[model samples]
Target: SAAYHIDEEVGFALPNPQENLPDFYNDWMFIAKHLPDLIESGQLRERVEKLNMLSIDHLTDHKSQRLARLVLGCITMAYVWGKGHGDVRKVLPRNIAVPYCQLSAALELPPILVYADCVLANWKKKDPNKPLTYENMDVLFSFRDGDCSKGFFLVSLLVEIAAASAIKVIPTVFKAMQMQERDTLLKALLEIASCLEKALQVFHQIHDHVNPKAFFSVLRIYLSGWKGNPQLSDGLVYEGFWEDPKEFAGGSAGQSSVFQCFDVLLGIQQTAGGGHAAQFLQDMRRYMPPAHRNFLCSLESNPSVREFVLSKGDAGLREAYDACVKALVSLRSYHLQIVTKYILIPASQQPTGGTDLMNFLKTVRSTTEKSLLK
Candidate 1:
């Protein structure tokens, strides 16, 4: 699947799941069920270490190739989110974490950094006047020579689109807040809505090529950070994961609430602030790709949008808040429609024989809906 191979001297052979496509998906699920156990036992980290030491090579077995990508995704998530105390602390050891970074660089998919640069960075040209557009993003995220299957490329692109949309709002949000200009803020908020809506449209365009259940259930778990529970807990807690916790309301793009940052920007309340919301947002930069994270941090250090909103009269504040909420609700409504067709209905129609997968999908869809409401 990749362009290079681990040296034979590295002594690690990738798994070869020599099954057909349907069976391959089933086999992946089987292996995935054992992941929590492997993680708890520290064996998953051990496996990652071995895989990291190898040079990239062509994986002939399609199933094995897919499994390899999945394993990489899982390990990367563990290394990021598995930090801090309790069961989470067991996620990564140095042996695995160190090599995982090295391997990721070699693979050219260094987690959040890839998405950040390709989608969010908004590279400036020598002219310094023009910014790159979504179409130009393909240059940074295309297939390698002789590599046909795009694999995770489209999924990554979707994530980038959502994130970039959010990032674009940061400066406008700050400007709107600093100047207390209602029109400026309203325009920015509306543009953000359009960007988010565009992301959903793009998802619909590619949605048929992938299995919704497998992508959301099997793959998304590896891409998620820990979202805090209601009450008592800081809800502001920083649980490490592959992507920044603040980047999405739920999981990845398909499940993410693109309007989340806008809420933060406009100081609209959904749930009560967890007290450390400001600090939590600040700290999340560590999880972003370095250059991208630094860029975001610089923007955040300035004055806040919340302060501006608080200074306004109730009527002005409500107008700003309503506009943001209406946009978010529109995006969520569309997302729910997709979820109904692709996830909910299919799970409902499946035979009772596959209770586990059905249950998982039910839980995921439910969680997605809940996040949308928040």
Candidate 2:
């Protein structure tokens, strides 16, 4: 043999399946019987056949060993709550709120949905007037942002998917013994709303404005309980068809942005008296434009006008679009998968559609790898 030197060697060994086998089966004899039973059952057989096919084509000869790894990866990817890992749970505080690793997981509550709010907060910090711009309108309304806006829209969208998935999954796990539609829906909605409210509160604080529009928009659009007009039984604002901004103001600058602030304030109002009273007083002082502030204050002092104004639509359709996008982003967080599937996919398939982010990623991978890395 030619003289040579081996370099950079490390310990390696074959995977031992029997070493960590589950107690469900102790030997091959038990496995053999279990396998036959699975093969005979319709659903179980279908799953086994699918696995076998996947192993033959995609997995290597060590398919059985890799099976555990795949299942583990799936579980971690799904849970996102970081509670899926035993090691992590051991060190973290028991009562501390869990931070989700997946967007789907965040969708169950306002935490994920409020991701959009964070993005908007950053935008407001950059330029408070940006939200009112026509060019940035798409950024406000979409789960996806264009070149003109911050690129965090994907993260917000993923959060929404997680929130949606959480709503579907958590009830089954926690309340496994019980099965009630009303209870399940209520829990899911509450969680989703809670996450959304947290996100919005964080968002408002960052923007130096505490308003209720964010919560109201989410409750109206996504939550089944608040989907229709606000009801008296729901303990929410029911200004009938028209709503007066005067009674809801404080100082001058009467109610110019009241429509924008309605939802979050309404949500707060439904929950308690103190927060609502404070918000109403603060809103009256800050939001009332100079020209309209006196008029609004007068309306507030008068009961009949306030009731009359409460019956009309206080906001516009564009406002609704902005509210929806903001709430969705704040509540759900963003996901590239959702953006690709819902936005890019549709755009690519459209007659006028030209380029997309997916195509861009593919092209960059194919053409620029060496140059970019160097």
Top TM-score hit: 1
Taking the tens digit of each residue's C-alpha lDDT, what string does model 2 give over 187-251? Answer: 44345445444434433221222112322221112211111212212222212211321111111
Q: List the residue pairs that clash in candidate 1.
A: 4-56, 4-57, 5-55, 5-56, 5-57, 6-54, 6-55, 6-56, 81-240
TM-score of every model versus the real structure = 0.43, 0.17
Give the per-residue lDDT digits (tens) of candidate 1, residues 80-166: 443212333323434333433444454443433223322222122223243323333222111112111122344334444454554
lDDT of each: 0.40, 0.26
> Which ten residues in a row are the worst by lDDT in model 1?
6-15
Model 1 stretches astray by more than 4 angstroms:
1-98, 101-159, 162-166, 180-182, 213-259, 269-307, 314-321, 339-374
The C-alpha stretches of model 2 lying farther than 4 A from their native spots are 1-109, 124-374
lDDT for model 1, please: 0.40
Query: Which candidate number would show the highest lDDT if scored against the true structure?
Result: 1
